Each structure stands twice: as C-alpha cells, then as structure tokens.
C-alpha cells in the first residue's frame, strides 16, 4: 500500500477491552474509614460512559484488600489477545501510593504490577489505563484568585512499565474532593468530557479538559474554616508511547 | 573530695520539669477521623502518674494542628533553667512520623525540633521525653504462640542528643486502645512507673512496659482482620545518660 504512520495505539481489535470499576463505599468499622457518600453516582456514570465507548464493564462493590488483589490477579491472567486496551477505575479512600480496601490498604504498585509488560503478555504494547479517585495525602489547595546510532541491540524490548497511564483525581500529596450529592469532582468531569469529546480528541487532550474543568468549576464549601474554599487539580501521569483515540477508521 | 561519677542525668534541680499531655479525643468531622474512646482514661492516669513523680503537669484537650505547634513553640521558649527534664505525652491518631491534630496532621519532627539542643538552650543536656500513643501505620501483628588524634577546639553535643521517644507500637503498625480500659501502652506505662520509678532506671522501666504490652494484651474483634492481634512498643533512645526519677 501507500505511506503509513504508527503514532496511535491500534484500537480496532474485536473488543475495546475490559473496564473494571472498583467502587468502595462502606468500610469495616475497625478501620475507622468514613462511608464515601456520592460514590455510587460516580460508579453509575462511569459504567454508562464506558459502556458507550464499547468497553466490557464490570462493577465491583466494597472489596476487601484481599479481594482487590485477587480480582486484579485474575483479570491479569485472562486472555486479552482480542482486546485493544485495559481500563481500571478505583473509587476509594487513599493516601500517596495506596488505595483502601474495605478492611485496609492496598499498594497501588502491587495492583498495577500484574499488568506489567512481562507479566500480562496479552496486554503488552496495549494501553493500560488506571483512573483513580482517592486521596493522595492530606494537603489542601487554597487556590489563587484570577552509520547512525551506535547500537540497535540484538533484541527489540520495551520497558515493562511502558504503556501505563494513571489519571489521578488530585495532585500528589493532596486530598481529593467528593460531593455527597453530585459525585466526585474528578469523575463527574471525566465522564462529561469523555461524552463530549471521545469521538474527536486524543485522550491526553480529553484529560487536559478534565484538568481545566476541575480546576476552574469546583471549589469546596464547608462550615469548617480548615476545609472551606479549597481547590483541586488532577494529575495525568503518562507512560504511554502512542496517542490514544477511543474511535477508529 | 572523693571520687565522682556522672553516668546519670542530674535530676535534683529545683523542679522535675513540665509534663505536657496533649489529649486528642474528638476530631473535626471533615477529617473523617474517629473519636478515640478510652483516651480520657489514659490522660487521667498519666496526670496522676506524673504528678506523683513531681512533674508540673499541663493537660490540653482536642488541639488543632495549629494549636499543637503553637503550644510546643511557646513551651520551648519558656525558661527551663530550674527544671531537670521535659516530658511531652501525645495521645491521638497518627501514622509514621505524624501525630493528628483535630483538623489534620502534624509532623512529629516539627514538634520535637523546637526542643533541639540549639533551639531550647535551657533544656540543652537535659532529657527530653516524648511519649506517643498513636498509630504508626496500618500493619497488624498476628503474634506467635509460645591518645585520640583530635579533642576539637569547642566541645559540642549533637542537637538531636538527649531525646527519647517512647512509642506505643513498632514502626509501620497500628497501636491498640481499649474503649473502656484505655490504651494498652499508656495503661502499662503508668502501672510500671507507679511500681518501679523509685528503683529502676527509665530504660529498664520501659522494657517492663514492653513485656507487659507484649504478653498481657491481645485484641478481640468480631472482624477477622482485626482479631487476635498483638503489640510491641518501641523505645527510641538518643539519651546520653541513665535516667532515674529519684535522686539523693
């Protein structure tokens, strides 16, 4: 054929892939973690949003740390050969590097490691997206008023950490905000931007719109001076090697 | 005059010193931190225990992070010249390196820095004791069934010298509190101070506390994750002398 370009992930496999949504609302009493009112709004929005993008969505509610790890391990051992991508959404309490099971913490690194390029071969070279609504610490943002190269090697390898994207709801070190009536600022903005732009913008550009929406349209209201009038900026952590479009042809 | 030894801190100043007890029981709703039932039992036991050791005890309840820092700053700026030692007791939520104010976290390093040898001169060379009942993480212990080349031109000490941290639990672990009896650590500490402050050096008292907590307590929970767990306190000593609460 004629000239070809390879700057975008191949997204025309028979299936878009799995969208695993882990929705932790109610936590074991002994942990002392509060119920996350509004998270069902998030989970329902995500299910519908990713259903419209043709993902096979699986919702899981109130999983223990043991169940989270088992679920991720089992999903990573499925055959993803006919799937374009993998999406995992985590809705829970958290701190930097950690997501809360209902009975205690899970290392994010433990979860994502199952999907490493060398450990999940049917996802090697495919985009692996982790969307995380959880705190990353306890900071609050007060805001501000506005021949050739020497070596080709003898083996074509890619890094095992390549082709991951972490779409974090908030900056490193900071709380993340969730409204008990409307759902979280981040997830509600994400779904809105995916619905408006998934058929026309590359994913990083969609997430940039999400960044702007969260940054400009939300601000906390609290009777507690410590928590009042606070702002949030999400953080895109991209180790992708290609552009990602949810459409094709 | 006869042979002398100085292996022990001078504890016969006119005053033993301050004992500052910060008792955080109720936390701002927005933090999501649970109320610490049983902590008043700890606070009352400590007040009495250190009163009997002749400390000037000050109890403070439900302090914000801002109030904790300002309290420590102010206390560190007092004149401690007539005082033998300094004691601070922290009762709160926490994680590794952190104690919870009622509205959010305080770095333990920020608190203790006020009392550095170079920043609180009237406590230089004197023992500074920080007793901490708080979690240090979320791990649970399942237990197991049973001449010289250089003298230098100015003698200095390290600014981090003469601190002791008596932690309720090992690094990385939860600390346990009973809602009706008080915390395992504080109740054991007070009991051992009551029994042994007039005859054992402080490290040996704290070792008895370690044994008591390790052997006599075990959690009971309807939740399998939290049931039948154990605790070992951790003594972190940067003291340079033996510490006896009695003298003469």
């Amino acid at each position: 054929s004629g000239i070809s370009l390879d700057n975008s992930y191949k997204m025309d496999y028979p299936e878009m892939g799995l969208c695993i949504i882990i929705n932790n609302k109610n936590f074991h009493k002994s942990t002392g973690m509060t119920s996350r009112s509004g998270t069902d709004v998030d989970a329902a929005n995500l299910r519908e949003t990713f259903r419209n993008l043709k993902y096979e969505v699986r919702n899981k509610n109130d999983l223990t740390r043991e169940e989270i790890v088992e679920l991720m391990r089992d999903v990573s051992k499925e055959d993803h050969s006919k799937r374009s991508s993998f999406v995992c959404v985590l809705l829970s309490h958290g701190e930097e590097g950690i997501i809360a099971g209902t009975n205690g913490p899970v290392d994010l690194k433990k979860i994502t490691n199952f999907f490493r390029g060398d450990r999940c071969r049917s996802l090697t070279g495919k985009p692996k997206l982790f969307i995380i609504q959880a705190c990353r610490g306890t900071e609050l943002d007060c805001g501000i008023e506005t021949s050739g190269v020497d070596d080709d090697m003898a083996c074509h390898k890619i890094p095992v950490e390549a082709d991951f994207l972490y779409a974090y709801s908030t900056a490193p070190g900071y709380y993340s905000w969730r409204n008990s009536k409307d759902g979280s600022w981040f997830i509600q903005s994400l779904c809105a931007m995916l619905k408006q732009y998934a058929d026309k913008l590359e994913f990083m550009h969609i997430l940039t719109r999400v960044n702007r929406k969260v940054a400009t349209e939300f601000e906390s209201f609290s009777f507690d001076a410590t928590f009042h009038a606070k702002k949030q900026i999400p953080c895109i952590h991209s180790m992708l090697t290609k552009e990602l479009y949810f459409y094709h042809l | 005059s006869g042979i002398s030894l100085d292996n022990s801190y001078k504890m016969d100043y006119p005053e033993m010193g301050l004992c500052i007890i910060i008792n955080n029981k109720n936390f701002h709703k927005s933090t999501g931190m649970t109320s610490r039932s049983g902590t008043d039992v700890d606070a009352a036991n400590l007040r009495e225990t250190f009163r009997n050791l002749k400390y000037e005890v000050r109890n403070k309840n439900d302090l914000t992070r801002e109030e904790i820092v300002e309290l420590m700053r102010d206390v560190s700026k007092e004149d401690h010249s007539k005082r033998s030692s300094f004691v601070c007791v922290l009762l709160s939520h926490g994680e590794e390196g952190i104690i919870a104010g009622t509205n959010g976290p305080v770095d333990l390093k920020k608190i203790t820095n006020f009392f550095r040898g170079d920043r609180c001169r009237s406590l230089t060379g004197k023992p500074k004791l920080f007793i901490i009942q708080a979690c240090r993480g979320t791990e649970l212990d399942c237990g197991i069934e049973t001449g010289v080349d250089d003298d230098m031109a100015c003698h200095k000490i390290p600014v981090e010298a003469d601190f002791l941290y008596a932690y309720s639990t090992a690094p990385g672990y939860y600390s346990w509190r009973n809602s009706k009896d008080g915390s395992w650590f504080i109740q054991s500490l007070c009991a051992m101070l009551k029994q042994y402050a007039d005859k054992l050096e402080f490290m040996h008292i704290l070792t008895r506390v370690n044994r008591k907590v390790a052997t006599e307590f075990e959690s009971f929970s309807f939740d399998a994750t939290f049931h039948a767990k154990k605790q070992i306190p951790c003594i972190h000593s940067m003291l340079t002398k033996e510490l006896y609460f009695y003298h003469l």
């Binding site: 509060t34 996350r36 009112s37 509004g38 829970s92 309490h93 958290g94 609504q133 959880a134 705190c135 709801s169 709380y175 993340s176 905000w177 969730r178 409204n179 008990s180 979280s184 906390s220 209201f221 609290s222 928590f227 | 927005s30 933090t31 999501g32």
Partner: peptide, 4 residues
C-alpha cells in the same frame, strides 16, 4: 463536599 467531603474528602476521600
């Protein structure tokens, strides 16, 4: 508004 609540924090996670």
């Amino acid at each position: 508004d609540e924090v996670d």
